[PDB]
Amino acid sequence: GTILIDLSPDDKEFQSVEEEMQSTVREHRDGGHAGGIFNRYNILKIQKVCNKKLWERYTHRRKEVSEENHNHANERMLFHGSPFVNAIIHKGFDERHAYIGGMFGAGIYFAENSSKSNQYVYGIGGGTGCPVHKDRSCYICHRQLLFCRVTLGKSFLQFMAHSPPGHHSVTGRPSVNGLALAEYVIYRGEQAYPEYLITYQIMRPE
Ligand SMILES: CCOc1ccc(-c2nnc([C@H]3C[C@H](NC(=O)c4ccnc5cccnc45)C3)n2-c2ccccc2F)nc1
Ligand SMILES: [Zn+2]
């Protein structure tokens, strides 16, 4: 029972999500090996995802977390990348499909940097790239990120199967022998809602 509402490029709501995606782009340690080489996207479509079932199951979990974190949800708008976006918008985030070899264990990963989420769109480390050209830096094939409402609650700072005791999420941090950029991880699908579905291409520089 999911409905996509196509947003006009002249919508302030569109422009807000567009601005956030473009501005949160960073240079990457791997020289774009995983995500491709770019400093800007081609923003084709931004659609608002609408599902009462998935929305109600989010708000319900958000309430519980607030009561366990001094009446503060710790709600953040964050980008999500994965090969499973089409499923997520229909059946919601599902921890049961989490990759156990992840750096912070079997969780659903988010980022405050759109360019980081991009790296995971065609699998872990961009996998074998786009299906058509088998190219991680493909400027041709259309990509999809989710821009999600995420309840982080009491987030454990680090650098596993569920959140540490007393906590509701993990915030990964830049270590000289570790991460360059921030990660955010939940171990429960109901703690995130995919509010916006963004269709885009990475754009060739020069
Ligand atoms: C160092 C980088 O390591 C990472 C980065 C991101 C993630 C991650 N975060 N979230 C995901 C996906 C797997 C979750 N799947 C669903 O929520 C889901 C929901 C509904 N239906 C599905 C059907 C098939 C697969 N997944 C689903 C979301 N993934 C994910 C899981 C497996 C493979 C690639 C991924 F991006 N895991 C590890
Ligand atoms: Zn391609």
Numbering used by the authors: 952 to 1110, 1115 to 1161
Any passages from the paper?
Tankyrase 1 and tankyrase 2 (TNKS1/2) are members of the PARP family of enzymes that control protein activities, interactions, and turnover through mono- or poly-ADP-ribosylation. TNKS1/2 regulate a number of target proteins, including AXIN1 and AXIN2 (AXIN1/2) in the β-catenin destruction complex resulting in WNT/β-catenin signaling pathway inhibition, and AMOT proteins in the Hippo signaling pathway resulting in YAP signaling inhibition. Tankyrases, through their ankyrin repeat clusters, bind to AXIN1/2, making AXIN1/2 accessible for ADP-ribosylation by the C-terminal TNKS1/2 catalytic domain. Several groups of chemical substances have been identified that inhibit TNKS1/2 by binding to the substrate NAD+ binding site either by occupying a nicotinamide pocket, adenosine binding pocket or by addressing both of them. Although the catalytic domains of 17 human ARTD/PARP enzymes are homologous, unique features in the TNKS1/2 catalytic domain allow the development of tankyrase-selective chemical inhibitors. We have previously developed tankyrase inhibitors bearing a 1,2,4-triazole moiety and binding predominantly to the adenosine binding site of the tankyrase catalytic domain.
As a consequence, in the following optimization campaign, the South 2-chlorophenyl moiety was replaced with the 2-fluorophenyl group of 23 resulting in acceptable efficacy compared to other substitutions. The comparison of the binding modes of the 2-halogen-substituted compounds showed that the chlorine or fluorine atoms were pointing into the same direction in the TNKS2 active site. This is in agreement with the clear difference in the measured potencies of the atropisomers. Next, all possible hybrid combinations were synthesized employing the East moieties of compounds 20 and 21, a South 2-fluorophenyl group, and three different West moieties revisiting the 2-pyridyl-4-methylsulfonyl moiety as well.9 From these six molecules, compounds with the 1,5-naphthyridine moiety (10, 11, and 12) showed approximately 30-fold improved cellular inhibitory efficacy compared to their counterparts with the 2-pyridyl moiety (13, 14, and 15, respectively). The binding mode of compound 13 in cocrystal structures was similar, and the hydrogen bonds to the backbone amides seen in the 1 cocrystal structures were retained. The large East moieties 1,5- and 1,6-naphthyridine (e.g., see 87, 88, 106, and 107Supplementary Figure 4a) appeared to form a more efficient π–π-stacking interaction with His1048 and a hydrophobic interaction with Phe1035, causing the side chain to gradually rotate according to the form of the East moiety. However, compounds with this naphthyridine moiety were less stable in microsomes relative to the corresponding East-pyridines, and consequently, 13 was short-listed for mouse pharmacokinetics studies. A water molecule forms bridging interactions between the pyridine nitrogen and Gly1058 and Tyr1050, and the same applies to all the cocrystal structures described.
